[PDB]
Amino acid sequence: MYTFVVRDENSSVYAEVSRLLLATGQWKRLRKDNPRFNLMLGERNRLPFGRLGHEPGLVQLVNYYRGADKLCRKASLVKLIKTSPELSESCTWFPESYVIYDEREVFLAAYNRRREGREGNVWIAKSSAGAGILISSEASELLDFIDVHVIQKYLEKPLLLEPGHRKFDIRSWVLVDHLYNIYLYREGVLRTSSEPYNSATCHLTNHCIQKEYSKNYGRYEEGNEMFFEEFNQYLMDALNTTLENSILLQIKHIIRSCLMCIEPAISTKHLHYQSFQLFGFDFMVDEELKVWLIEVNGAPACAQKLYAELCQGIVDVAISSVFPLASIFIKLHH
Amino acid sequence: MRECISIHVGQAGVQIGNACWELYCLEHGIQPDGQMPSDKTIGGGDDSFNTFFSETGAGKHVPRAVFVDLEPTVIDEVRTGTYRQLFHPEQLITGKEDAANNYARGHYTIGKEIIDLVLDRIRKLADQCTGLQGFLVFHSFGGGTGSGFTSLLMERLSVDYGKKSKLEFSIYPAPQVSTAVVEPYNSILTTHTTLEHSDCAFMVDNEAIYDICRRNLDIERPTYTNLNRLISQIVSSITASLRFDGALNVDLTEFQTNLVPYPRIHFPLATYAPVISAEKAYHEQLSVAEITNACFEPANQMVKCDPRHGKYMACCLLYRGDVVPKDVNAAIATIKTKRSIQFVDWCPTGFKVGINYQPPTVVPGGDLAKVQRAVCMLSNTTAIAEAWARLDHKFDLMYAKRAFVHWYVGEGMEEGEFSEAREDMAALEKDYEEVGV
Amino acid sequence: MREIVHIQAGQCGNQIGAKFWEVISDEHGIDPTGSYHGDSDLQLERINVYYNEATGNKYVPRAILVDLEPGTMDSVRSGPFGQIFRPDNFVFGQSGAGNNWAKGHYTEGAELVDSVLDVVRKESESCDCLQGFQLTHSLGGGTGSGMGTLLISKIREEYPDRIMNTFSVMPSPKVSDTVVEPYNATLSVHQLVENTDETYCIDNEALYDICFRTLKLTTPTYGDLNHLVSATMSGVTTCLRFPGQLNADLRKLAVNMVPFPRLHFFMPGFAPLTSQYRALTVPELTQQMFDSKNMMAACDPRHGRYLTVAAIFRGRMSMKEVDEQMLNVQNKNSSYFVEWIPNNVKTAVCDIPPRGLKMSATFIGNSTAIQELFKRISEQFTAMFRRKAFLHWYTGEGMDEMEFTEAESNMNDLVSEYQQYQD
Amino acid sequence: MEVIELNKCTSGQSFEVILKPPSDPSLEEIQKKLEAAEERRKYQEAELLKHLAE
C-alpha cells in the first residue's frame, strides 16, 4: 500500500496517472502537505527537492528532475548547446540561435554575412514568457520588439505536406526513469498548420493558434493532429521513404544527445531520492528531410487519443518499477 | 605554538568529545594514564600536540578541554572511563537537573545559574596558555543544554575572549535517533543567537552518520558509540592540522580565511572517505583518485544535500595516509571533467590541499577498518542551505499552531524571540540563494 | 538520582497503587521485606527513582498511602507487599468521604491534608533531586477524587516547579458504585486541567470491555480490572525505572507529549492481552498496541487525531524490526497523525520484559479523541444537573450550585479545545 | 591547472591547485536579557501563588 501526493492540479498527464494509481487498489493518496509519501506528483515551480529523501523508511520518488530546466528553457537551451563540448557550437541539428537581453553584437555579426551573401536572412524572436513572437527579415525590428529573448534562424525551407502546402511540427514524448533509461514513446503527433505556407498563423503550428486564428482548423486531419500511421504512409506514397529512416533516426539521436549531456548534472543515481520526468520534444523537418530541434518541454500535455496509453506507461516503467504492484516505448540505449 | 581549548556541552558534546580525545591519544601515542613515551621534553614544550595537551611536571599530558553538562550521568562516564586519568576534576562540570530538551530552560533558567562557574573553569585553562588561539565548541542542536547553554556560553566567550576565534562542531537533529519533538525549535533558537559569535561551524547531520554506518559498516541499528567513532574521525581530520606539523589550516584563523569569505555563510560541508567495515577481512584499498571522487558523492557527506545545485565558495582537501601531490592533481583533473563543480564568480575555482603522511587511526576493536589513505573534504557549498530549509519548515509547521511554545515562555523567554530567530533564518536562507544562483 | 514521590489516595487509588508496587517490586527484584534478590544490575540502576535505601541494603518505596477510612489501607498493610511500605507513610482518617467530592475536598479532607503534606515534605527533603510527584486515584469517589485534587493543589503551591503526574480512573455506569460519580468526576477534571502536567486516563468502561470482550471474563471483578491497570502502570513507567534515553524523566515526557498546557490527558494502551504461551511477533505487538481494543480510555482513535505518541517495547527483539513496524503504522495511517507536529511518534526499547511475558508493548497517546471520554462524563453530569438531582449531598457540605455550573462550563471548554485541534 | 605554495615537511605537505581565475552585545546587555527572563518567571510564579491563594 504505497502513498502518493498530488501537488499539480492542472497536470492533465498526472491527473490520469493519479487516477490509474487509485484504480489499482494498492496506492493511497494523501494530503498535498503530508510528508509521509512514496511518490510526489510535484508542482512545476519551486518544487522543494531539498526536503525529499529525508523520511526514514520511505523510498521517495518525484516526477521531475531537479536541474532539467537547463534543457526546458529557451535561453538555457541555447547556452547549454553553445557551451557544452558534448554538443558544441558546431551542432548540426539545432538552428543558429542567440540570446538577447548577451549576444547582440554576435547576432548582428552573422546577420550581416547573410544580408551581404544574398542568402536567406529571416530570423525569429521568442521567449519563455509567451502564450508573443516576431518573425522578420530586418534585425532592427527583432531587437526593438524585445525592448530575456532568444533569436534563432527561421527555417525558411520547411517540409510541406500535400495536399495543402502546409507547415507542421513533430512532438515526441520521452520518459526518463530513475535509472536514467531513455524511453521514447512510440506514438508521436504532427501538429499541422491548416493554412498554406506563404513565404511572403500559417507559420506558427501551435494547437491553440490553429484553433483560434486559423479558418481551416480540422479540415485535413482531426484537430490539426496527424499521427504517425498517416504520416508514415504519406512519406511512402509521396517521398518513397519511411518515417523511421527519414526522420525518426535523427529524432532518437537528438533525444539521446540532449539527455546524455545533462546526465551528470541531474542524475539521481546515488541520491537520497529518485526522479523521473516526462519530456516533450518539438522537432522541425525541412524539405531535405533533415530534423531540427526547436525546444524541449518539461511539463508537456498529450494527445487525447494517447493519454490512455502513455499515462499507463508512465505507471509501468517509472512508478511500478520502484514500487511494484501485485512495450509502448523505444529504449534509447546508451 | 598557540593553544586551543575544547568545550563539550550537553550529552552529544561530551560523548563526542570523549570519543575524540580517545582518538587523539591513540594518534599521539598517549596512554590512558596520561604518559607519552615519545615526548622527550618532560613537563613542557611547544610542540604541535601541545596545542591540545598541557604537560605536568610528572609527565602527564592533560587535554585542554572542559566538559559541561546540566546532568551528571554523562560526565560521570568520563570520571570513571578508560581515560579517566587524563582529566582533573576541575575540567568536569555537572548540574542536578538538565534542560529537558528546552532551549529556554538551558539558556535562561538553568544557564544563568552556572554560566559563571563554567567561565571560571575555562579561565583556568586560559591562564595556562601563552598564546590562546580560541575555542572548539561541541554540542547538539536539539538538546536543551546543547542548544540553550551553548548559545549563552558563545555570547559570553565573545565578551571575555573577543580577539579569539570560535569554531563549532554541531549535531544536526535527525528523527531516526532524536529524543525530542521540539528539536527544530532548539536548533533555530540556538543558530540565531550563536550566529554572530561563531567564525566557522561544522554541522553533522545524524541522518548522514546513521546511513553511512548502516550502508558502509553494515550496522543494522547504529548506536551513539557507532556514530561518535565515525564523527571523531571527521573531527580528527579537521583538527589534525592544529595537532601536527603542517602548513594548511595551521591555526583557527586559517579556517575562516580558507573556508568562510562571507561571515554569516560559515557552515562548510564535510565529506569523508573511505568508510570500510572492519568485519571485511580483506578489502581492496581505494586509490587517491577513488577516494577523491568519493568526496563528491552525496552518500559520503556529513549533511545530505546536492552540491550540484549550488555554488562553491571554497574547498579544502585533507588527506591522511599514502598520498603524494602528483596523484591528487591527477584525480582533480579527472573530476573536473566529470562532476558539476561550479564556483561563484568572485572566487577562484581551485582546491587547497593538505597531506599528512600518518594514515588514519582507528580505535582497536571498533567498526572502522584501518585504511592506507583517506580524505576529508571541507567545501563551502550553498547546497548546505537545504538543511536550513528542512529545519525552518518543521519550525513553521509547529509554530503556526504555537505548539509547545508554552514550555519556553514558562522559562521566562518571550514569544517574540521565536519569530525573531525565524526571521534571522529566513535572512540566512536568502543569503544562500543569492550566492548560489 | 531524580526521585519520584508516589501518592495513592482513596479506595481505588490505594488498591491500584498497591498492585503497582507489587508489580514493579517484582521487576526490580525486591522481595516483600524490602531485600533485593535480583540477578541483573539493570534492576538497580534506576532503583532510586521509586525506592529509598535503608539500613541493611533495604529498599523502601517512596510511597505515601492516604485515605479517610482505615479499611482499604488495613488491607494494604495485610496484603502481599504490606510490610514493604514505610509505616509512618500511612496517613488515614476515620470518617470517610461517602463518595462525596465536597467531603474530600472541602470538609473531611481538609482536616487531614496537612498531615499528608508533612509526610510529603519529609520524603522530599531526603531527595537528591526530586523531579515530581505521581498520584493514583479515582475520580468517581470522594477521597481519591475530592481530597486527591485538594492534595494536588497544595502540593503545587509548595512545589510549583515540580512535575505533577496522575493515574486517574474515570467512572463508568458499567462499573459504578453510586450515581453521583459524574458529579465527582466533572469537579475533579477541572482540577486536573489546571494542576497536573500528565494524566493517564484509565477508563473503567474500557477495562470492563477488555475483560468482557477480549479476555472473555463474563463477570469481571475490580481485581480483574486492576490487573490491566498494573500492566499499564508498569509499562508507562518503564522509561523512568530502567536505563534509556527517550522520556527518561517526567519533565522530558511532558515536553514531548504536551503541546498545549491543558491538553495533557493521555490514552494508555497495552499489548498483549491474552485470555498464552504463544510467542508474540513484533508486527503483532505493533498492530495490537495501536488498536482501539487495547486502549484503556474507551475512545476510538479513528474518531480523532494523534497530537503525540509514545511507544515503549519491552523484551529482547529486533530493534530494526521495531523501527520498520512503527514506521509502517504511521506511513499507513498518517491521516490520524497531525501534520503540524513533525515526527510526533517516539519509540523506546527496554530489554527487561514484564513478569510472565517474552515481550510486550505499552502505548501512551495524546489523541484528540479523548474528548469522547469528557463528552461522555459531561452528558451524564448534565442529565442529573438540569434537574438538580442528588445535589443536596453537596450543598449540605457548603457547596453552591454556581460551582457546578462552572465545572460544567470548564469541561465543555476542554472538549471545545480538543475539537479545534482535531480540524 | 597551476600548483602553487608547495610547503613540505617530514609529516606531510600542502599546496594549492588553481583551475581557473575568478571573474557583539556587552556583558551588561546580556545580564539585562538574562534578568528580564528571570523577572518574567518570577511574575508568572507570583500570579500562580496569587491564584492558589484565592
Ligand SMILES: Nc1nc2c(ncn2[C@@H]2O[C@H](COP(=O)(O)OP(=O)(O)OP(=O)(O)O)[C@@H](O)[C@H]2O)c(=O)[nH]1
Ligand atoms: N551523534 C550523536 N548525537 C547525539 C548524541 N547524544 C545525543 N545526540 C543527539 O542530540 C540531540 C539531543 O541533545 P542532547 O545532547 O542529548 O541534550 P543535552 O545537550 O544533554 O541537553 P538536555 O536537554 O538538558 O539533556 C538528539 O538529536 C540526539 O540524537 C551522541 O552521543 N552522538
Ligand SMILES: Nc1ncnc2c1ncn2[C@@H]1O[C@H](COP(=O)(O)OP(=O)(O)CP(=O)(O)O)[C@@H](O)[C@H]1O
Ligand atoms: N527556427 C524556427 N523556424 C521555423 N519555425 C519555427 C522556429 N522556431 C519556432 N517555430 C515555429 O513556432 C512555433 C512555436 O514555437 P515554440 O515551441 O517556441 O512555441 P511554444 O513553446 O509556446 C509551444 P509548446 O512549448 O507548448 O510546444 C512552432 O510550432 C514552430 O513551428
Ligand SMILES: Nc1nc2c(ncn2[C@@H]2O[C@H](COP(=O)(O)OP(=O)(O)O)[C@@H](O)[C@H]2O)c(=O)[nH]1
Ligand atoms: N479500576 C478500579 N476502579 C475502582 C476500584 N475501586 C473503586 N473504583 C472506582 O472508583 C470509583 C469509586 O471511588 P473510590 O476509590 O471507591 O472512592 P474513594 O475511596 O472515596 O476515593 C468508582 O467509579 C469505581 O468504579 C478498583 O479497585 N479498581
Ligand SMILES: [Ca+2]
Ligand atoms: Ca613536551
Ligand SMILES: [Ca+2]
Ligand atoms: Ca566575534
Ligand SMILES: [Ca+2]
Ligand atoms: Ca471533624
Ligand SMILES: [Mg+2]
Ligand atoms: Mg514551451
Ligand SMILES: [Mg+2]
Ligand atoms: Mg542531557
Ligand SMILES: [Mg+2]
Ligand atoms: Mg469505594
